[PDB]
């Protein structure tokens, strides 16, 4: 082909290739194995991916993210009207469809959600082409299992605009199950729970798999819960610590809070493999450094409700599928937040000690399965 898989994610995207019998997940030009689903418009240029996310603080009204929350919807939809209230960018209506409105080269422009997503897809396509050489022609692109046909078709339109032959739109939990070979493992029916906790969304899906055929039995979750919520908890804790030690409230100061959040995001990643993380911020406020450290136990304490709370969508997906938790044959971890040991422990204890499918980087599992599926389709 080449055989290409794209996870077009709400805040991050991932691209993989199936080559010499195996998947390789592809790092972008900054060496990052996942790429922000971000597009920024400036006085001179259109930035995509890491370049767009890196200047977001400097240009928030013209930096688009979350276009996946708009794609395939109507402007009048309850979710659109609700989501709009939390974005720093303007959303407007054209023929009843939402468009983002930005400043670009000193003029006002509007873009359909599939136009922003096509720009993200083009960046993923060029990432794959730098890695492979030559041109990428086709891709499997994934969507959430709860997406309707307008959302699916608008995702496909993004691919068409990019100039990709979209071989198939497949469900994200389905691609994760394919990554683990669960359609080929021990071939009756398998009940598979996919536990997908990303940066800003939480999706639980129950699939059945039989003779290589997938059926979505139930979906549950929280469309506004992710890793960013855990970082908010750490930011409040550490802002209070800075106040206690240095008698300075950084709360009213946008830059000090943003820099604290950057340190907290990085600390949280380290806490997935170490029991402590060090914060090293130079001149956080009024020339006062903030060098400190945080333990894993403290991180878990600050997030006790949020982590334990992820089991309620698990219980609801089971009740909707009319399954007892003992009837799940496979559990798959997806999304960067599933690396958190306390989340893995809670999920494993809920499932009476059952081992978790977790050996694939969870932020890459969806693109990994999409790349396998692409290989099958091109043959
Ligand atoms: C680049 C690119 N890919 N898709 C679109 C719509 C664009 C653009 O217009 O810049
Ligand atoms: C990487 C990483 N390690 N731990 C976490 C929570 C992540 C992530 O990507 O969110």
| Token digits of residue 296 | 């894993």
CATH 3.30.420.40 maps onto the chain at 1-64+120-184+358-379, 185-225+310-357
Residues after which a C–N gap over 2.5 Å breaks the chain: 187
Cα(263) to ligand 1 centroid in Å equals 33
Q: Which of 193, 229, 191, 197 is nearest to 209 (CA)?
A: 191
DSSP-based three-state secondary structure for 326: helix
Q: Which ligand is nearest to the CA of 162?
A: 1
User: Exposed, middle or buried by CB within 10 Å (0-12, 13-18, 19+), for 161?
Assistant: middle
**What distance in Å separates the CA atoms of residue 249 and residue 243, rounded to the nearest whole number?**
5
Measured by CA distance, the residue closest to atom 5 of ligand 1 is: 119
Measured by CA distance, the residue closest to atom 7 of ligand 1 is: 119
Q: Which of 336, 326, 339, 341 is nearest to 366 (CA)?
A: 336
Cα(169) to ligand 2 centroid in Å equals 27
Looking at CATH, the fold of the domain delimited by 1-64+120-184+358-379 is given as Nucleotidyltransferase; domain 5 (3.30.420)
Indicate the Cα dihedral angle 227, 228, 232, 238, nearest 10°: 70
**What distance in Å separates the CA atoms of residue 6 and residue 267, rounded to the nearest whole number?**
28
Q: Is the CB of 48 under 6 A from ligand 1?
A: no
Contact 311, 347 (CB under 8 A): yes
**What distance in Å separates the CA atoms of residue 270 and residue 279, rounded to the nearest whole number?**
11
Q: What are the residue ranges of helices labelled H in 107-148?
A: 113-132
CB atoms within 10 A of CB 83: 18
User: Which pairs from 352-358 meet CB under 8 Å and 24+ separation?
Assistant: 352/325, 352/326, 354/328, 356/331, 356/332, 357/180, 357/182, 357/330, 357/331, 357/332, 357/333, 358/333
User: Exposed, middle or buried by CB within 10 Å (0-12, 13-18, 19+), for 109?
Assistant: middle
**What distance in Å separates the CA atoms of residue 238 and residue 229, rounded to the nearest whole number?**
15
Residue indicated by tokens 């136009």 = 115
**Resolution, rounded to a tenth of an Å?**
2.0
> Interhelix angle for 227-246 vs 254-271, to 10°?
120
Q: Is the CB of 62 under 6 A from ligand 1?
A: no
Measured by CA distance, the residue closest to atom 6 of ligand 1 is: 115
Q: Is the dihedral of CA 255, 249, 65, 358 positive or negative?
A: positive
Q: Is the CB of 269 under 6 A from ligand 2?
A: yes
Residues 6+ apart with CB under 8 A from 254: none
Question: Which residues are identified as catalytic?
Answer: 7, 68, 172, 196
Contact 2, 132 (CB under 8 A): yes
User: Exposed, middle or buried by CB within 10 Å (0-12, 13-18, 19+), for 102?
Assistant: buried
Q: Is the CB of 117 under 6 A from ligand 1?
A: no
Q: Is the CB of 115 under 6 A from ligand 1?
A: yes
CATH for the stretch 65-119: 3.30.30.30
CATH for the stretch 185-225+310-357: 3.30.420.40
Contact 141, 129 (CB under 8 A): no
| Token digits of residue 199 | 């940066």
φ and ψ at residue 37, rounded to 5 degrees: -85, 60
Measured by CA distance, the residue closest to atom 3 of ligand 2 is: 269
Cα(161) to ligand 1 centroid in Å equals 7
| Token digits of residue 311 | 């089991």
User: Which pairs from 16-24 meet CB under 8 Å and 24+ separation?
Assistant: 16/364, 16/367, 16/368, 16/370, 16/371, 17/128, 17/131, 17/132, 17/371, 18/371, 18/372, 18/374, 18/375, 23/179, 23/368, 23/371, 23/372, 24/131
| Token digits of residue 209 | 């798999």
The verdict on whether residue 61 carries a ligand-binding annotation is: no
**Which atom of ligand 2 approaches the CA of 230 most closely?**
6
The verdict on whether residue 131 carries a ligand-binding annotation is: no
H helix or E strand, kind and range, residue 110? strand 107-111
**Mutation choice for ligand 2 from 201, 231, 339, CB with most ligand atoms inside 8 A:** 339
Cα(75) to ligand 2 centroid in Å equals 33
Chain centroid, CA 208 distance in Å: 24
| Token digits of residue 150 | 């307008």
CATH 3.90.640.10 maps onto the chain at 226-309
Q: Cα separations (Å) of 235 from 18, 29, 266?
A: 40, 30, 12
Q: Is the CB of 13 under 6 A from ligand 1?
A: no
The verdict on whether residue 227 carries a ligand-binding annotation is: no
Q: Is the dihedral of CA 232, 235, 240, 243 positive or negative?
A: negative
H helix or E strand, kind and range, residue 298? helix 296-302
Cα(212) to ligand 2 centroid in Å equals 31
The verdict on whether residue 108 carries a ligand-binding annotation is: no
Superfamily of domain 226-309: ATPase, substrate binding domain, subdomain 4 (3.90.640.10)
Cα(70) to ligand 1 centroid in Å equals 17
Measured by CA distance, the residue closest to atom 1 of ligand 1 is: 119
The verdict on whether residue 353 carries a ligand-binding annotation is: no
Q: Is the CB of 9 under 6 A from ligand 2?
A: no
Q: Which ligand is nearest to the CA of 163?
A: 1
CATH 3.30.30.30 maps onto the chain at 65-119
Q: Is the CB of 162 under 6 A from ligand 1?
A: yes
| Token digits of residue 113 | 């959600």
Residue indicated by tokens 């990709």 = 164
């Amino acid at each position: 082909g080449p055989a290409i898989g794209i996870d077009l994610g709400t805040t991050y995207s991932c691209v993989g290739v199936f080559q010499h019998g195996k998947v390789e997940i592809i790092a972008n030009d900054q060496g990052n194995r996942t790429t922000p689903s971000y597009v920024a418009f400036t006085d001179t240029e259109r930035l995509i991916g890491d370049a767009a996310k890196n200047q977001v603080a400097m240009n928030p009204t013209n930096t688009i993210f979350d276009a996946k929350r708009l794609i395939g919807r109507k402007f009048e939809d309850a979710t659109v009207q609700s989501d709009m209230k939390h974005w720093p960018f303007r959303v407007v209506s054209e023929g009843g469809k939402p468009k983002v409105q930005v400043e670009y080269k000193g003029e006002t422009k509007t873009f359909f959600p599939e136009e922003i997503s096509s720009m993200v897809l083009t960046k993923m396509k060029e990432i794959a082409e730098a890695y492979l050489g030559g041109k990428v022609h086709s891709a499997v692109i994934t969507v959430p299992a709860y997406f309707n046909d307008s959302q699916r078709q608008a995702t496909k339109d993004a691919g068409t605009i990019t100039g990709l032959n979209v071989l198939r739109i497949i469900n994200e939990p389905t691609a994760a199950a394919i990554a683990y070979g669960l359609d080929k493992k021990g071939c009756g029916e398998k009940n598979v729970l996919i536990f997908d906790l990303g940066g800003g969304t939480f999706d639980v899906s129950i699939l059945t798999i039989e003779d290589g055929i997938f059926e979505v039995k139930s979906t549950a979750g929280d469309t506004h819960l992710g890793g960013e919520d855990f970082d908010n908890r750490m930011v409040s804790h550490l802002a209070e610590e800075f106040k206690r030690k240095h008698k300075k409230d950084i709360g009213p100061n946008k830059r000090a809070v943003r820099r604290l959040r950057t340190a907290c995001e990085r600390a949280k990643r380290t806490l997935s493999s170490s029991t402590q993380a060090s914060i090293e911020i130079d001149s956080l406020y009024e020339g006062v450094d903030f060098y400190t450290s945080i333990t894993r136990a403290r991180f878990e304490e600050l997030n006790a409700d949020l982590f334990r709370g992820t089991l309620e969508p698990v219980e609801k997906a089971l009740r909707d599928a009319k399954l007892d938790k003992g009837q799940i044959q496979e559990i798959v971890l997806v999304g960067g937040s599933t690396r958190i040991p306390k989340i893995q422990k809670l999920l494993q204890d809920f499932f009476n000690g059952k081992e978790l499918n977790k050996s694939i980087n969870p932020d890459e599992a969806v693109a990994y399965g999409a790349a396998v599926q692409a290989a099958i389709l091109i043959g």
